[PDB]
C-alpha cells in the first residue's frame, strides 16, 4: 500500500537455482520470486523457461503497489539472465535500464579447487 511507482529488480542468476526480487528504488524488498518455490524443485528448475515462471510470480506479490516502471539487475551467470527480463517485459512492467552486476573481481580471493571426477 506504499505505491513505489518504480523500483529496480535484482536477478540473482545462479546455476543450481535463480531468484528475482522486485526491490524498490533505495533497495528495499517489495517482492521476491524463486524457482525452488515455483512448484518444480529438485533440479528441474535452473532452465530459463523455469525461472520465467518464477520471477513472474512477483507480479502476484509485488502487484499490491503499482510498479509502472522498473530497471533490471542481472547478477551471476546461469539459465535466468535472459528469461527473467523477458517474462518481466510481458508481465506488463516497463523498463529503464538493463545491467549486469555479476561479481567480477581482479584475481582477489582464490576460488575452490573442488570438482575432480
Amino acid at each position: 500500500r506504499k505505491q513505489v511507482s518504480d523500483g529496480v529488480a535484482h536477478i540473482h542468476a545462479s546455476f543450481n537455482n535463480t531468484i528475482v526480487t522486485i526491490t524498490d528504488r533505495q533497495g528495499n524488498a517489495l517482492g521476491w520470486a524463486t524457482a525452488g518455490g515455483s512448484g518444480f524443485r529438485g533440479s528441474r528448475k535452473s532452465t530459463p523457461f523455469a525461472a520465467q515462471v518464477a520471477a513472474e510470480r512477483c507480479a502476484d506479490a509485488v502487484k499490491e503497489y503499482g510498479i509502472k516502471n522498473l530497471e533490471v539487475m542481472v547478477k551471476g551467470p546461469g539459465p535466468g539472465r535472459e528469461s527473467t527480463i523477458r517474462a518481466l517485459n510481458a508481465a506488463g512492467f516497463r523498463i529503464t535500464n538493463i545491467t549486469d552486476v555479476t561479481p567480477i573481481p581482479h584475481n582477489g580471493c582464490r576460488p575452490p579447487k573442488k570438482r575432480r571426477v
Binding site: 529503464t96 535500464n97 576460488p111 573442488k114
Partner: protein, 51 residues
C-alpha cells in the same frame, strides 16, 4: 555494462556488453584456479591458432 533506451521495447543491446566480460571470465573462475595448468594450456592452445 549500462543499458538505457527511449521508446519501450525489449530489443536487446544487452549482448553488446556480452563481449568483454559476461559468462566467460565468470566460468573462468567458477571452479579452481590454474597455476601451471594455464601457463601451459595457454601456450599450447596458442599453437592451435596457426592454422
Amino acid at each position: 555494462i549500462k543499458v538505457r533506451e527511449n521508446e519501450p521495447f525489449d530489443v536487446a543491446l544487452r549482448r553488446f556488453k556480452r563481449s568483454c566480460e559476461k559468462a566467460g571470465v565468470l566460468a573462468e573462475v567458477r571452479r579452481r584456479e590454474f597455476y601451471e595448468k594455464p601457463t601451459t594450456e595457454r601456450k599450447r592452445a596458442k599453437a592451435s591458432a596457426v592454422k
